[PDB]
Amino acid sequence: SSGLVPRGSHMGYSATAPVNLTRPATVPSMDGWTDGTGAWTLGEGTRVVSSDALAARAQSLASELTKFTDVDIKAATGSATGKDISLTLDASKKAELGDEGFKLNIGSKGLEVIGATDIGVFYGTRSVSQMLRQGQLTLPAGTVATKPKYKERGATLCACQINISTDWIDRFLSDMADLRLNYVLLEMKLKPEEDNTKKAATWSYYTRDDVKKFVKKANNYGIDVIPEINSPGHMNVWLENYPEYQLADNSGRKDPNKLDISNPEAVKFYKTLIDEYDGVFTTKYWHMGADEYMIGTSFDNYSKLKTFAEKQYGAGATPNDAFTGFINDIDKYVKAKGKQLRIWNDGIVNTKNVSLNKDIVIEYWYGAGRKPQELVQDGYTLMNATQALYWSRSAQVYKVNAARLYNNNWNVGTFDGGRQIDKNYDKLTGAKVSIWPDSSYFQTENEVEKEIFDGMRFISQMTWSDSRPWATWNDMKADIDKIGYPLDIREYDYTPVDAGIYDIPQLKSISKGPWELITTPDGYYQMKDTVSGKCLALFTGSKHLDVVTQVGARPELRNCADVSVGQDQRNTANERNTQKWQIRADKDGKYTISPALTQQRLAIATGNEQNIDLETHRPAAGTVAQFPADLVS
Numbered sequence: 001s002s003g004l005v006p007r008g009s010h011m012g013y014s015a016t017a018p019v020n021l022t023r024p025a026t027v028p029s030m031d032g033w034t035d036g037t038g039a040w041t042l043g044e045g046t047r048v049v050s051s052d053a054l055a056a057r058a059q060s061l062a063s064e065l066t067k068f069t070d071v072d073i074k075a076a077t078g079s080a081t082g083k084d085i086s087l088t089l090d091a092s093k094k095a096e097l098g099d100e101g102f103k104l105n106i107g108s109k110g111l112e113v114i115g116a117t118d119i120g121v122f123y124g125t126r127s128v129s130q131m132l133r134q135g136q137l138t139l140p141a142g143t144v145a146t147k148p149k150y151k152e153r154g155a156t157l158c159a160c161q162i163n164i165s166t167d168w169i170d171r172f173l174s175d176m177a178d179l180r181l182n183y184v185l186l187e188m189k190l191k192p193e194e195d196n197t198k199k200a201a202t203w204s205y206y207t208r209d210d211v212k213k214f215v216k217k218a219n220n221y222g223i224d225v226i227p228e229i230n231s232p233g234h235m236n237v238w239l240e241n242y243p244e245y246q247l248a249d250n251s252g253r254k255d256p257n258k259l260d261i262s263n264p265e266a267v268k269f270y271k272t273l274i275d276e277y278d279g280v281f282t283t284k285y286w287h288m289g290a291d292e293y294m295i296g297t298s299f300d301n302y303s304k305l306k307t308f309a310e311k312q313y314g315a316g317a318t319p320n321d322a323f324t325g326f327i328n329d330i331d332k333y334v335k336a337k338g339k340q341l342r343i344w345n346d347g348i349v350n351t352k353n354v355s356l357n358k359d360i361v362i363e364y365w366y367g368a369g370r371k372p373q374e375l376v377q378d379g380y381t382l383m384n385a386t387q388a389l390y391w392s393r394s395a396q397v398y399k400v401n402a403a404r405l406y407n408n409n410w411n412v413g414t415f416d417g418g419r420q421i422d423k424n425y426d427k428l429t430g431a432k433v434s435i436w437p438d439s440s441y442f443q444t445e446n447e448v449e450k451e452i453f454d455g456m457r458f459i460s461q462m463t464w465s466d467s468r469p470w471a472t473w474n475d476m477k478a479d480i481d482k483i484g485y486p487l488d489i490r491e492y493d494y495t496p497v498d499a500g501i502y503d504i505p506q507l508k509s510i511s512k513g514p515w516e517l518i519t520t521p522d523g524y525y526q527m528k529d530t531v532s533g534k535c536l537a538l539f540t541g542s543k544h545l546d547v548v549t550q551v552g553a554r555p556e557l558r559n560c561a562d563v564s565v566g567q568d569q570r571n572t573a574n575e576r577n578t579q580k581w582q583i584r585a586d587k588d589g590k591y592t593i594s595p596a597l598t599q600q601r602l603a604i605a606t607g608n609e610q611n612i613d614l615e616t617h618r619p620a621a622g623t624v625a626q627f628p629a630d631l632v633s
């Protein structure tokens, strides 16, 4: 017989270790590891030891490691033993480590993590968590120091028109932290509450309380959450109810997507929104978008902007000048609030009388138009937001192919359309992936989460390490899978109730029930009415992005769709996903039911809910309808 038995190494340091014991992988990679003698084992009695200042980081790391390892790991202050993980903040090491980098020393003093900042220590602890959560509790001795090549590393998350649940955003933020990603551009609506903007409080929106909460979580993770309110284009969700601010074409037809930048009350409305955001985001940036103002048309159809340009910026001024002038004016405005402005690059147009301010960060996604190398020559600060790093729920042209990018040698200087710039350009800030909803019924947010996994690891690797230590993408993939999600994602209770037969009094206006609940692979439920044999759907109402956003829309019974299939079944996506329901448990015990696509909450209508949509249609009082959570708590 083989005699196979667990090795069962003693906890702490051992001078003996096999020469080729695996060093568990991390993402980002920690390049330039220097091997030392022996190995260190996490085991019974191992503690995370730190100063008082780092106590919170130590306690959190101990708790997490206890969960992953099944060993009771406690935090402590005072002296560390070779059994222990030590956290050290040494701010004198800024040259070696920078604002975000860290050093690991693994040896007879235990596992030491050193950073020059709180975020640095935290980022070192992410590698420690990654290394210890792969079923191996012995780590080869040695040392490494690592810091990110680029300062901004992250994602555009367009939580726009449709709502991305705050629970999803919290998970997203935990995933970003695991991956040492420090940037999220969040295009979203913060619920407008002043008399002069409140008619734009249509769904999707986020409450001030909800934003304050995820910004606080982000900041603890070293993540800069930058808001975007796109302007002067893509303004439908803001101007629908304010036709007075919409731009009319030569024939007098207004577009709810277009802000009239010649109307000073329209510009003031935009600035009012900036002021509303300022109370809840902590970032020093403002992103105003400036993409696709004239999509589906041209400035020739808006002669009024030419007229405005000439008045404002002198004879010969063009609509491009007026557009750039609006950008420069928003720059002036947010600077005076201590912020730096950011735009999308298609906002950079050929001007005559006005020139675009060079203190504006350019996030470059669109390679038609002024080329990267040209902007380099100009001296602009640039972030790589290539379309190669896009996902869309509906536009299948936009699915990140991490394999292809890894194998083809993309790096952060590889701008849109494969146009290379010097990756060491001293004003290249970094790079990001971008997560766009577009026609939104094709994929649930949970399917989005599954799909983006590989691409998030790819961008993490190339923005921090800018190296390819895995021989191929497939080698990377095997290690990223072994590393897995951070604790918070593993803990999220996607489906808190068992499949089965339920009485659901909230649904009595639809059927007396009972209801058969079954779970879906994306972490939702289908709810079948045992009376009619049909399934509950949120199907009907006014939409944005082909998803029902109408506050007060009522659910309905429809023939049962097959909820067991994946997102490649595009032909049935709408019937399927309109039949998916998210069930959450209260603090504590009570359950809420939300349409998976809309992320509003079912409630019995009282007739006292207050919202712009409800001024013009209300569900019959006492019937069950969807509402944003803030109108029904």
Ligand SMILES: CC(=O)NC[C@@H]1[C@@H](O[C@@H]2O[C@H](CO)[C@H](O)[C@H](O)[C@H]2O)[C@H](O)[C@H]2[C@@H](O)CCN21
Pocket: 158, 160, 161, 187, 230, 234, 289, 291, 292, 344, 365, 392, 395, 398, 436, 437, 438, 439
């Ligand atoms: C920078 C970006 O690529 N802009 C152009 C478009 C994206 O447009 C956004 O669409 C969302 C809704 O999905 C918002 O309305 C936002 O204001 C727009 O900027 C679009 O998502 C994406 C891809 O479809 C391809 C082109 N970009």
